[PDB]
Structure formats: structure tokens, C-alpha cells
Amino acid sequence: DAEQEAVAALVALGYKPQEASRMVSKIARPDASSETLIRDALRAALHHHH
Amino acid sequence: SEDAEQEAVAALVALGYKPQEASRMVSKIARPDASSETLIRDALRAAL
Amino acid sequence: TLRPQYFKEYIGQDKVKDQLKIFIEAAKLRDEALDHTLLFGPPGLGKTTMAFVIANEMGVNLKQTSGPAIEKAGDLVAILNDLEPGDILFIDEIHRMPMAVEEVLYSAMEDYYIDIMIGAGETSRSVHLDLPPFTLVGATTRAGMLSNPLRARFGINGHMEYYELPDLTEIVERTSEIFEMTITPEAALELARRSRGTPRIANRLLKRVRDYAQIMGDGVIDDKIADQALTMLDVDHEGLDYVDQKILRTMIEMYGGGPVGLGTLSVNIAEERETVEDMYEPYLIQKGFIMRTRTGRVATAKAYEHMGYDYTR
Amino acid sequence: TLRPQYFKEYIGQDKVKDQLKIFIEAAKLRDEALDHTLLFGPPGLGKTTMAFVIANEMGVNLKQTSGPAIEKAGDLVAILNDLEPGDILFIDEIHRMPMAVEEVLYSAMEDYYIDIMITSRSVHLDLPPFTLVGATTRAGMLSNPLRARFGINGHMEYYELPDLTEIVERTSEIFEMTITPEAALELARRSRGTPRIANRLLKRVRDYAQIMGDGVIDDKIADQALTMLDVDHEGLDYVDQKILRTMIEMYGGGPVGLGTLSVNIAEERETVEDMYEPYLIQKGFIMRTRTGRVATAKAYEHMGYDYTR
Amino acid sequence: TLRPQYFKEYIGQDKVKDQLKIFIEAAKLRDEALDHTLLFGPPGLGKTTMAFVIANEMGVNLKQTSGPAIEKAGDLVAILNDLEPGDILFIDEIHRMPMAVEEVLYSAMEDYYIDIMIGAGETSRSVHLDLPPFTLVGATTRAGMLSNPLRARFGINGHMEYYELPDLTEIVERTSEIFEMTITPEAALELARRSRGTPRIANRLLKRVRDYAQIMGDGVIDDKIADQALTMLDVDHEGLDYVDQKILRTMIEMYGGGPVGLGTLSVNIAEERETVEDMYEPYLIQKGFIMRTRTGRVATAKAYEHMGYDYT
Amino acid sequence: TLRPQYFKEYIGQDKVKDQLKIFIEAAKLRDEALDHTLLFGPPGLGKTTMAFVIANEMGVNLKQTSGPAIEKAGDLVAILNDLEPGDILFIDEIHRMPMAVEEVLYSAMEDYYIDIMIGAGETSRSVHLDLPPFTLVGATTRAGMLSNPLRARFGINGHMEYYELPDLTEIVERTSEIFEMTITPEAALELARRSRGTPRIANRLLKRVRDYAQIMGDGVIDDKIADQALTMLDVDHEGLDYVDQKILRTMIEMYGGGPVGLGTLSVNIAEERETVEDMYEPYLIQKGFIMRTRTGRVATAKAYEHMGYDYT
Amino acid sequence: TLRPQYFKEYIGQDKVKDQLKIFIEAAKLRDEALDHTLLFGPPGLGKTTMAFVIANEMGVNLKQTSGPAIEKAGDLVAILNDLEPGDILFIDEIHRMPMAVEEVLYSAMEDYYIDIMIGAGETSRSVHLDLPPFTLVGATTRAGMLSNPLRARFGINGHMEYYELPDLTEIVERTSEIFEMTITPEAALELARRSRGTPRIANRLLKRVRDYAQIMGDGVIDDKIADQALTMLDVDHEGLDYVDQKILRTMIEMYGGGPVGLGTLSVNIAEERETVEDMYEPYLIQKGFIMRTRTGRVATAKAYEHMGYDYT
Amino acid sequence: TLRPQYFKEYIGQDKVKDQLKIFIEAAKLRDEALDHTLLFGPPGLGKTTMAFVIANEMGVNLKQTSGPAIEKAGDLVAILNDLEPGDILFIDEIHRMPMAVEEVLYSAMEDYYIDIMIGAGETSRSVHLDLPPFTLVGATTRAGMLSNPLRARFGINGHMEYYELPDLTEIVERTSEIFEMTITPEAALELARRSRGTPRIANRLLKRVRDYAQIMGDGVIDDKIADQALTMLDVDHEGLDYVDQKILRTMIEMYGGGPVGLGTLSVNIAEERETVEDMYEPYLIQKGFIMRTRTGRVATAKAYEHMGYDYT
DNA sequence: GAACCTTCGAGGAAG
DNA sequence: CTTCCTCGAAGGTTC
Ligand SMILES: Nc1ncnc2c1ncn2[C@@H]1O[C@H](COP(=O)(O)OP(=O)(O)O)[C@@H](O)[C@H]1O
Ligand SMILES: [Mg+2]
Ligand SMILES: [Mg+2]
């Protein structure tokens, strides 16, 4: 169920459903909470630079 | 060499080229052994 | 000459021409390109030709493009790779470049490289492309809309100005030869005085006077033909058309010099508001004959004396 | 036909007509195409008619389009691609073209080549020598770069009483109606200096003579017909006369404001300012002043009142 | 019916009606289309009605549209070319058309053709679309809003005037015959004199007097019934409304006739400046009760003798 | 509920009620729809309330919308397509519509049809929608902003007026019943004299006094309880507020009653020029505290005695 | 937390607290929502904090937004659908809401219903929405900039005034108690006088003084330490800001003391008109530094002697 | 040094630099992050360089972005989630980010968490995210263009100002060392005076003088050579640009000192009126050469002696 | 010389 | 991009 809530939050941030679905679907952790999922889907999509 | 072939297309996409067109542009280059820099240089030059 | 190759052949612009001469010579004494240059001024004075002469003095090739024609960052980078060491890039109307491209030009101008970034998260990477040393020459007409980050990179500023009778007259003479028309020096001065300082206007006058001199005359442009040719056309010795004279005459005769509103003046001369305000009124202000005030247009003392009227406060 | 075809038929416009003859004759001698020409001025003076005359004198085929009909650069390329050496392209209401289209045209005029992008792809053309002719009422609406490319500028003017008299006689023979010389001058004085207005009055008078007359125009039927239209010998309509009368009898000649005057005649404010006052100001019957508008001494003489300074 | 259909039934407008008869009769003799006509003037004087009369007298079918319904060149280009020879096209509120569309009519009215881009891409071409002979008819209240090149193309112009008491009486009696109501000639005049010169207002007063007579009376419009109904509506024998009477009274009793400014007068009657200047002052001026001067409004002698005060 | 549902409940507006009763009864006997009606006047007087009563008396469903909610011709056509025979359409704040929309009603009101363009653009033609009988009701605070052709189409006009103390007193009593409170007649008259003649203001004052009496009192509004609450709300016995009082004080203490210019007086009170002229000056003039003169405004004796100063 | 949460903690504003207490207590004996309340006054006086107190005394949820944050009329309808029964809606800067959006609130406040257009194109239709009981709290600086239709619908008005020296001093002692800081009574009195009578400024200064006294001193705020710390910052002896000095200096040296208009001054000082009109003039006037005249503002002698110029 | 790492290396801005030192070290004693800081002032004075120095003195990694680079709340949340306790986020042109982001920025700055409501209708939920401690540093050109409610969230203000002649000359000398150019203290002071306070203007003139000295001189920048080179570049001794001199010369010679309007003047010289008011007049007014009046601009007496004209 | 009233003109912001 | 409208100046009368 955390998948739907995660995508809904990403949708609430303005990301398109297609990207939000892919972003969350790429992550997998049965023990993750809806908060911890959001904090990982975004961290994987930002281009980190040094 | 597949890494550079993919890389050259991906960087070319960030420059505003379409995914399909970037794939074609790189596909037109023959030498596989050369680095992504050499590929993007030729890919850009050929499109001028 | 009309196709000049060196500063010795370029007519006018002595102020900017003397400044560039030093910067070019100092650059040649080192293994360095000329600093980035930005040219300002009203449209139609020869900025395109000036860029070409700069490249010949440096001894390098000139590439040409324009801001409206570029549309994606890849377009700019593609041209930059075609540049050989020391090449000059001329961008016309540089103030209309899209921001998406402007942000890439900053790194190229300052360090001569571009750093394309790709991937995301742990896949975040970049590729560094070296660029050969090059000089960017920009030309603009609305200097007040360039961003401060861009202006900070341009080192040399150049201001173009209208030509003057001693140097505008020489253009008329050289153009007369291009169509084998003999012109007396005293006549060329009468055309130059009426050309408003613009070469396109002097060329237009010479073409029309030529047609008159070969149909109503002996094929020679003498002082007598010039007098007649410039009388068939309405152009006054100050360069005022028939409509210009009518506007000044109406304000002085009927409104005592003003103030008078644009709408009230338009109905007297039978012209549209946009035609008086954009075609005729701009040159009258530059010449100093009228002024615009919160209550309407007013005619200056200079207009009264030119039109032959007694000025009283 | 109603539109003259040659300069021998084009009555009036001596200034513009004289210049074009000099420029047209010289171009023929050099075997070159005529310079780009712009015709502008008030409505109905003959701008469109002059464009057809220029083509006939040059002996060339005239291509025709209009500004409102051109919406995108793709349209203009198709048109220009049809030009042959020496062809003339005439664009009416040229002030309507979008700015995206004008930027293309002033390049083609100077260099005779086109290099434009129009799924997008580049298109390139190399045009033959040709002449562009433009006609417009709102000349000031064109951009300064475009106006600088035109080499000839013809500014039209109003006609004189002798010219309009000859124009009325010409039109009368096309309708095969007989008109006396002293009656033609009566229609001229009322035509406000414009050929289109002169032709309109003749048609209205013709309809009257066919019903209330014997199909002939004479110095008696004209007075009767003009009394039916209620057009004064100065060309003033019924409402024009009402305006002058109200100002002289209710405000002592002014000054009076635009709002006060409109409400007194039951007219709409914008109709008086745009439709009626322009002619009265040009004839010198009314003047605008910082405090209002006042009727001049000429108005008192025309209406028949005692003038007092 | 409520709208007349032929010149036999159209009362008044003698100047306009006489001219149209002559031009229409001449057009039939030559067997050709009528010239373009423009009808303009104040509201409710009969502009729309006359356009239908023209079509009936010419004996052709009328096509109708309006300026607000037309918004882009494709709309008008689709309406045009649907015309058959001799059709009449009537555009109400012609002043609402966008000026980009007005310029398409310049060629159509003068030379019966329009330039159209046809095809697409390389196949795009400019070709003449050639129209059959037709007559354009426009009606508007804001003629000064039309472009000068367009107004110059209309070959006939009709300016509508106000009606006189004899003509308005005959209109009231005519309308009183469509409704099944008996009306005495005295009451017909008593209404016409209050109608401000406009046929639409005369019809409105009759409908209101009808409702009263059939509820509070025997359903007959006699002199006794009419006076009672007009007292309920509170409309003076000069057509002055209740608020109009209050304005004149306030000027005579507080400012001694003026001069007084518009702002000062409006606040004393609890009306906003806009309603006074737009709804009430315009009629009082045209009838001579008020005079506008550089110092303010002034009450005329005619207003004193109407309200019963002394013109000292 | 607060809003009256029938003419038997509606208090005041005798002139408007008397006329509307006759027209509504006559319409029923003929079995026809009511004529278009325009309600106008100051804010808070009952314009919206009356529209619902008319619908209850006719016995039909009232469709509602507003001027600023309609933005293009398509919106209006959608609303009009949903009409059924005899429906009443109410448009509040009708002066806020754009002109390009108002000109579409011209045909709908007179002939019950609308010209529309339909089709995607490749193929399209003009067609007439034919509307069923309906009654349009409009309400506006400023009739001067409507165009002349639109006002001419309304067949019934209702100008609203301010209420007198006897009628406004009965409204205060009625409202107390819906709140289940008890009020002494002396208190009901005290509240009325402070309400500036507007029912909306009278209801607001009662609601505040009600809260006070039931919190620090015995739950009854007596003359002594009302004075305490109204003194805490800072409403004078003449209905003046503190800002209004500050103005009158300055005019007497610094200028001896005037004459004084508006700009000069504004400075001494730190008030904006137009705020004083548009918000406060109107009521002071209508009550007779201030008087305008050619050299400035002047305080009357009534303003002296109310403030306690000595007149000279 | 720094923000007070109950009326027993909220210092000052006694004239406002007394009224809100009575109205809130009355609204609890009846199970009803509180009436819509408008709070207005200078910025930073504590009106946002007051909204939280009301919500906590009612014992209901609070939701916050701002005028500019509602981009279009549709966004408001969507927001209202999330309000639960009894929820309080606070709208800051309510005077800068767009006209097309403001006219949406009128019907929602007065009858708890709102008419909206739903769907698009051929599916476009009108609908009405019904809202559960809610209380709107509006805050604005310009009490007179609100439109009369909106302003007349608020039931309670709250005018908030500046704090006095005894009240601000107690707030300083309160704030220094939540932090683990010690301040002597003399420094608290000095800090209050230096803080323009505004709680937000008084808190901001204390935070910065705390850092200075910890590093450059013994960790205790004393008059000797406070005066130094205030001089290391830009706070003048009279609490004038560094920008205030520019205004007073410019008026005397560049305009010769005035009179000068803020419009012409603003562009000569290179500042936003809105900032000089709202941020600087209200204090400089209310403290006698600036005087207002019909011709413009003038600097008083107190400003001449303070800045050190010659009172010519 | 030219690009310092610590305050001891930074040249100038002594007032701002002295304030930050106390706040930065005081924060370490408490073992907590630094309050949010706002830097403002003219462009090019060193605002970006200052942000790096703060990060080094704290011992924290600096993260950088800009107002235009953020378009949606997802962007900011992504950056803020990647912060580590004590990190500094720098946002250039904080006044230019979209208003929809600021709603999220409030809770981030004030609460360090965000609430993202989700669901609709019968459903209503939210996700709440917690963020580590961090310091925000924002830069703008003007303090008044920033959002009023946002401006209250910042606790420290830093007003940058123009550099003095001793600081500019030091910069010029250091830069000459980089180019290996020998410049005497006399010439160094000349370039400073004519650079009107901005370091990058001083750097531009130095580069141009080198090219002149290397060809027209003996490679050493003497005072005699420097003065000659500057006349070739057309830079006045007061630092008036070529365009700055053109404005003053025109007003005196063509308009007798004025008054003259901006529209007239900007058409005489080939410039855009929006450009003259933004890039050129500001410096001329601050130096007292131009003064604004109701009738237009006027040339002061100082300009007459500067340009070399006989004053009236 | 302070206070009202009417009139014209140039901007700009709201579709 | 165009139309509308509102803010500001000043001429003229009277105390
Ligand atoms: N105090 C200073 N010391 C050394 N160099 C400076 C100083 N102030 C400005 N500069 C120089 O001038 C330019 C300022 O750039 P930057 O700091 O980005 O300006 P800003 O951020 O104020 O727009 C840089 O080239 C910088 O090296
Ligand atoms: Mg034509
Ligand atoms: Mg009609």
C-alpha cells in the first residue's frame, strides 16, 4: 500500500504519474515506510554533483 | 565500447536532441573503439 | 572602398577605429586572441562590415550567425567545434538568444571549455570538452536588456555614430562610379547634407537623381541638375520632406507653437496618430525642432528661425 | 471601365504621376526592373488603381495577394516561388502581415535569396529580379527596417475642382447618361475632394432622374435631387449643419466641450469626434482650443449670422 | 404582427422611407442588385424592422447573422460563398466584428472577390474566389467605431430620427388591435405624449396599462382607467419619472436654480454620479429643462412653469 | 429563516410591492411568463431577497448565476440551453458582464433566439437556436454602467428606497423571534435609529447586542443593557462612528464652522482626500450635519448642539 | 514556544481581547460557529498570533493560506472543499486578492453556497456548491482598501494598536525567560524604548544582543552592555533604522526641509514607494518626526536637532 | 588575497565582516547552526564571495543554486532532503523564485518539516517529512522586492556598500602582480578614483591600460601614461562613461539646462527610455549632476562647471 | 489666494 | 496587442 501513498506524494510535488510510478517502482523494500520511500525515490532522481 | 555508444547518445540528449535522433546520429559513426568525446565531436560535426 | 579590407579603407568611425587598432596590435604581440568585443549603436551603420575588417587585421577567419536563428544548446556547441584557433565568431542581435543557450556560453567564454553533466544519483557524471581559443564579437541595439552575468564577460565596448559631411560625402562619390555616373564634388555635398547621416539614405537619393539626369538632362550630375532634381523631390536643404514642413507650419500658424495634442495635430494634416508619431516626429526631435511635454508638443526657437518666423515669448 | 488603365486616362495626381513616368522610363532604358514602390495616403484617392497602371506601363504580369490572406511564412514562400524575372508582386493592406513574416520579406528584398526553417526543415531559394509594390493607409505601422528597403515613396493628395469635374463627365459616359457641364460642377463641389464620393453621388442622382425625371440630367433635376439628399453647397450633411447651428445659437460660438455638445444633439460621443468633426476642421469651420472648440468667422458667413469678435 | 412587413404598414421615417422607395424601384427597372445600405441611429427607432422590410420589397430571401457571432476570418469566409445570386446579407451589431475581419470585406464589397490561401505546404496557393452579386446590409448604434475605409464603401446611408405625436398615436392604436383591447382616442394620445418619442416605450406603457385595466378594472382602456394607471406608475404628463422630478425640485429649492455642480447635486439625492449623468440628465437637456454651462447646471424658465414655482 | 419568503412577510418597499402584485396576478390569469424585470438601488436594501419572493409567487424553479461568473459567449449559451418553459433566470451583479456577452442577450430577450456558429471550422454554418418562454431578472447597484439598448429591453423597473423608522423597527422585532430572545419595544427603537436605514446593519447590531445580554445580564435586551453594548461597540446615538466624530470636532475647534476646503480639513485629521469624500461625507450631508457652499463646506447648528458646543 | 496560545498569555490589546472573549463565550453556550472577523492595523502587531488564540479557544482546527497563493477563482473552490465543519480559514493580505476571485467569496460567506462552472466545451454547465459551517478570519493593513461588498459582510471588526512601554517591557522579560538568558530590569526598559513599540522588532533585537553579550561580555545583558550592542547593530538612540537616517538626511539637505512629496522623494532616494509609504512614514509621523501638509510632508525641528543640522 | 578563504583574507566590507564574526563564533559556543542570513546590495560588490567565507569559518560544505533553477516544490524538497546537519544552502536571487515554492519554504525555514496533504472528497491524508538543521543564505539586489511574509523569516541582515579608495587601490595593486605589470602608487590611485567604487570596473580599466602601455609607452604604467590612456578610452576624471557625458552635454547645449522629459531626451540620443532610467541616471543623480523635477530633469550648477560651461 | 468646476492630454493594465 | 479608463495639469470664475 505504501507504493500508492508514495506515488501520491510525488504527484503532490508535481511529478507526472509516469515518472512517479517508475521512480517508486525502481525502489523496493518491504520494510520501508511511506516516509522512507519518498526520501529514496527523490534521492535517486537528483543529479548529485561535486 | 557499448558504454561510450550509450554515453554519447545520453549526453547528446541533454543537449536537446531527441532520443531517436541521438541514436541515429551516433549510429552514423563507424569507429567503436574511440571514446565518447570523439563520438560526440563527430556526431555534432556531421549534423552541421 | 565599398568592400574594405583594412582600417585604412574603412570610411568613418575614427573613434572606434583608433581604439581597436591598439587592442589588436597588443594582442598580436602575445600568444592570445583578442578580448571579447561588444558593439553598440543605432541600426544600419555598418556593424556587419566592421566585424569582417577586425578578422582580416587579426589574420583569422570569420564565422557568422544570429541570436534568433539559434534555438538549442547543441546548436551553439556544434558551431564552436568548427572554430579553428583564433577564429572570430560574430553573433548578430545577441540580445534575443534564448536563456537555455546563454547559460552554456558563460563557461565557454571564461575558460574555453564546456562540462556536460549526465545521469542521476550514483550515475551522476560529467564530460569535459576543450574548446580552441576564440574571440566572440557581439552586436546589439537594445543594450539595456543584456543580463549582468553576460555583460560582465565582455571586455571591450564600442559605440557607433552617425556619419558627418566630411566623410559622408566620400561615400556618394564612390557610389557614383559603381554605375559610371560623373558627379561634381559640389553636387555630392548637396546630396550628403540631405542624407540624415545614413548611407542607405544617400544611396537612395543618388539613384533617383541619376534617373532624372539621364531623362531630363545630358547624363551628367552638375550643380544645375542637382538643384532641379532636388526641387522635384520635396526634400528641403535640411532634409525635411513636404510633410515635415507642413507639421511645423501648422503648429506655428494655428497654435502659436503649442502645446498641442497628437490627436488635434493629426486631424489637421490628415494623418494617422501612428504615422506622425513614428515616421515624422522622431527626426524632428533628433534635429531639435520640437519637444514633448505633459500637455502636448511644443515648437522650439530653432524651428521658428528655420521656418522664417519671428519668435516671441 | 471604372478603373483607368493608362496614365493618359489617370486624371490628376500630377506630382506622383510625373515622378513615376521619369522612373519608369529610365528603368526601361537600362533593361532593369523598377525599384520597390510604396503607395500610401487617405482612403479612396486611387492607390489601388495606380498599382494596375504601373504594371501595364511596364508591360509585366501582376501577381496579387493581401496581408490578411498571409498567416505564416510557409504561405509567403509558396507565393515567392512562383515569381519569374521582372514579375510584379502587389500586396494590399501590407500593414497586416505578422512580424514573423516581415522579418523574412525585408531579407529577400535586399539579397534576392531566402534561407529559412519551416518535422521542421530548412528551405533555400534564389529569387529572380522582381519588384514589390505595397499599398497601405497605416504607413506608420510598418517597422523601420522594412520602410528603409523601399526606394520609391508615393504620397497621395486630394483633387481640385477642375479634375473632379472631368472625372464626373467620364463616369457619366460609361453609364451612357447625358449630363450638362454646369451640372457636373455641382456634384464636384459636394464630393469633398474624393473620386469615390463623386461616383456615389452620380449613381444616386441617376436613380432619381430615371424615376422622377426623363432619364436626363440637367441643371434643374440636379437641384431637385440634391434637395432630396439634403447636401449643402459646401458638402455639409444634415447633422453637420445641426452642429454649427447649435454652437452659434446656444453657446455664442463656444468654447464648448465634446461631452456637452454630443448630449445636446443626441449623438454618441465617438461618432461626432470620428465621423463629423474631421471635415469641419479641415475646411476651417471649427477650431480646437485648450478650453474647447469654437466656430470661426467662416461658419457665421456660411450659416448667415452676424459675426462678433 | 407586431413588426410591420411592408411600407404600407411602416409609419413615420418619411425621409428615409421616401429615399428607399426611389432606389428600390430604380434597381428593379435595371434588373440588378441593390447597393449596399447602412442603417444607424438611436436605440429602438426601427433599424432592425426596416431591414426585413427591404428584403420583402425586393422579393428575395434574407440571410441573418450578427457581429458577435463572427470571430475569425474562417467564419466569414464560410458564410460568404454560400450566397446565391441576389441574396441579401444582414449583419446586426456590425460594429463588433474584429478589425482583422473587416478588412476581408474590402475586396468583397468593391470587386466581388476574396483572396484565399488553398492547399497546404508546397501545395499552398492563392486563388481568387469569385462571389455572385449580393447586397450587404448593416445596422449599428456606434457608427463611429467602424473603420473609415469600410464606411466609404456603403452606397446608401440611413440616419433614423425621433417620431412626432401624430405618428406615435397611430402606432399605439395599431398595437392596441393586436392585443384584443378597446382603446379610446383620448387615452391613445395621453400615452403617446409620455413615450419620449420612441415606439418601443409606447408599446411598454400600453402593456403596463393593460395589466392594470384587466385586474383593477373592467378590461377597457378608458380615460378614467388610464389616468389612474399612470398615477400608479408615477409618470408625469411630460414623461418625467419620479427621480427626474426630484432633481428639478432640489435645484430650485436648495440652490435657487444654480449654477450647481454634478457632484454636489448627486450627493443630495443619494444617487451615484454615473446614474445621474447617464440615465436622467440626457433627456432633461434635450427637452430644455436644464442647461449646461462652465459654472454648472442651471434650471431654465420652462422648468419653473412646469413645477409651479416663480421665475424670479 | 431570516429571508422573507412571501409578500405577506416582506416589510416595506410599498411602491415596489404594489406594482409587482398587479403584474404577477395579470400574468397568471393570461397563463403567460412574467416580463423581464430590473431591480436597482443601494446595497443591502433587499434586491436579492425580492428575486426569491417573485419565484415563490410564480411557483417556478429559480436558476441562479452571477455577472463575474460568465466570461465568454459559450458559457451563456450553455446556461440558456438548460432553460425550460416558464423558468426564471436570475443574474446578480449584471453590470459586471463583458460587453461582448451583453450584446448576445439582445436577440434572446426580444425574439427568444440566438445566432451561433457551430462546427470544427472545416465545415461550419450559422444556425438559430430557438428558446422557450422565460423571464430574466437582473439586480444591480449601478444601472448607469449598463448599455442603453439593454436597459430599454427590461419591461419592469424597481428602484429600491431606504427604510423609515416604523418599518425598520418591525424588522428588528421579527429578527428577535428567530433568535428566541425577548426585546423591550424601547430597545428595538434605539437599535433602529442607529442602523442608518439599512436592514443588513440592523441585523448585525442585534446579533452583537444579543451575545452581550446573554453573557453579562439576564438574557433580556432592555434599554439599559443596549446602551452598555452600543457604548462598547462605539456607535453614537445618531449612528455616527469615531471617525465621523473626529471630522465634526476638527471643523469646529480649528475653523469655527468653516467655510473650509476639503484638502485643508483632511490634513488636520490625517485622512485621505477621497476616502473622506467617498466614504464619510455622503451620510453627514444626507442627515444635515454638513452643508456644501461655493467657498467650502459648513457645519450646521444641528452639528453644534449634537457636540455640545455653543452656536454663534 | 514564543507564540502565546491563550488569552491569559496574550499581553496588551485589551480593547480587542475584551470583545473577542465575550463573543467567543456566547458562541459556546449555543453550539454555533463564530462570526467572520476582520483584523486590521500596522504590520507586526500580532494579528496572526491572535488567530491561533481564537482557534485554540474555540477548540477547532486551523488552516492557513494567503491571498496571493490562490492563483485563480477555481483554486478557491477546491480549497473550500477541504474545510471540515467548524474549521477556521485565515486569509492574510486579503486586500490583494484578485477581483475575479474576491467576488467568489460574497455568496460563500453570506449563505454558505457558491455557483461555479464545471466541465468544458459542450460539457460546460453551471452548478452550485454548498459549504459546511466555517469561520473566515481576514487580516489586512489597509482597512479602507477593501471593497464595500466584501467589507460590509464581516460581522466583527478588530482594530489593533501599538504597545506601550509597560507592555513591551513585560514581553521582553517573557522572551528572555524562554531562552536561558538573564537580563536586568534597566536593560529591558532600554530595549523596549529602542524597538518602535513593535513586538517583532523587540524579539529580533534581543536575539542579536544575546550573542554579543555572550562573546564580548560576561553573558549578562546590562545597560552598559545593551547600549554598546545596540550601537554595534544599526539601531539609533531613538530606535531609528539606518534607512530612516537616509530619509531624514535627504529631506533636509537635498530639499531644504520640504515640503516634498513621497513620490518625488522615493525616486530621489532610490527606494520603493510602497516601502517608504508603509514602512517609514507611519512611525516618523506618529512620533512627530514628520508633519503632513496640503503641499506635502515637512520635517519637524526635533528631526533637525537630532540629525545635528541647523534649524534655519 | 583576491579570493579569500577566511575573514582575515577578505578586503573591505569591514562593517558586515565585523558583525558576522560575533554571530558565527557565538553559535559554536552553543553548538547549534547559524540563523538564516540575507545579503543585499548593488550587483558585483562580492555577495557570492562572502557566502563561501561564511561556510569556511563554520567548517561546512556549501551548496549552491538559484531562483530560476527551481520551478516546482519537488526541486526544493529534493535539495533540502540531500542536506546534512549544518549544511548551508545558498540561493541567488531569492526574490525571483516562483511564489508556489515560497509556501513550502516557510515551513522549511520555520519548522524544518513539510506537510504534504493528500486525498480528496471523503479522503484526506498527509505525509510529514522531517529535515535536519540548516542555514539558508539568500542574496538579492533590493530588500523591498522580497516577499513581505518571507522577509520576516530571516534573522540577520547584511547591507553591502561601495569600496573606499584605500581598498580599491589595494585591489588594483594585487591584480597588477598577476599580470606582472609594474604600476606606481600614483597611477594606482588614479584608476581607483575613476572606477566609481566597483572592483570589476577597476579590473577592466587595468587590462586596457596594459595594452596601451605595452605599445604606446615603455611597458610601465606611469602616472603620465595612465592619464593619457584614459583620455583615449574616453573616461572622464569623475568616471563618467561616454554615454554619461553625452547626456549632460545635450541638456546644456540643446535645452538650456532643461527642464526636459525622459521621452524627449531618450529620443534625441539613440537610446531606449527604459535603459536611460535604469543604467545611466542612477549614478548621475547620486553624484549630484542631475535633479528630478515636476517638469523633468534639470542640470545642476555643478554639471556646468564640470563640463566647462558658463553658468547662468 | 483659497476653493469649484469644467476640459484636455498622456499613460498603462486588463483582457 | 488593443481598448479602455483614471490620474494629473491648467484655464477661468468668484469670494
Ligand atoms: N573584496 C574583494 N576582494 C577581491 N576580489 C573581489 C572583491 N569583491 C569583488 N571582487 C571580484 O569582483 C568580482 C565579484 O564577483 P561576485 O563576487 O560574483 O560578484 P557578486 O556576487 O557581488 O555579483 C570577482 O571577479 C571577484 O574576484
Ligand atoms: Mg484599395
Ligand atoms: Mg435591433
Side-chain angles (χ1 to χ4, degrees), chain E residues 169 173 183-190 223:
Chain E
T169 308
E173 290 178 344
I183 187 163
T184 291
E186 298 292 80
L189 177 60
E190 199 56 51
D223 301 38

Side-chain angles (χ1 to χ4, degrees), chain A residues 39 43, chain H residues 31-34 36 60-61 63 76-89 105-114 128-136:
Chain A
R39 293 201 297 117
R43 203 165 198 156
Chain H
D31 193 14
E32 51 171 27
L34 183 63
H36 309 306
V60 159
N61 291 302
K63 288 164 177 168
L76 178 64
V77 177
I79 290 180
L80 293 176
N81 184 44
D82 203 24
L83 298 185
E84 189 166 56
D87 286 355
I88 294 157
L89 171 60
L105 191 63
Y106 302 145
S107 316
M109 290 179 77
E110 186 178 345
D111 300 325
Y112 309 98
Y113 63 69
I114 71 183
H128 168 282
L129 309 183
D130 192 11
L131 297 170
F134 77 98
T135 299
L136 192 68

Side-chain angles (χ1 to χ4, degrees), chain D residues 48 92-93, chain E residues 110 153:
Chain D
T48 295
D92 215 341
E93 288 84 40
Chain E
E110 263 220 335
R153 284 165 164 73

Side-chain angles (χ1 to χ4, degrees), chain B:
Chain B
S1 302
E2 309 306 327
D3 303 337
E5 291 266 21
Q6 182 164 242
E7 281 174 18
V9 171
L12 188 63
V13 168
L15 260 57
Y17 292 93
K18 294 176 183 177
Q20 166 276 310
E21 198 60 18
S23 302
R24 180 186 173 246
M25 285 166 72
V26 179
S27 298
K28 193 172 180 180
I29 310 305
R31 186 171 287 185
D33 186 47
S35 72
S36 310
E37 165 168 22
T38 70
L39 296 180
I40 196 70
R41 283 182 184 277
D42 290 349
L44 289 168
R45 188 178 185 281
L48 192 71

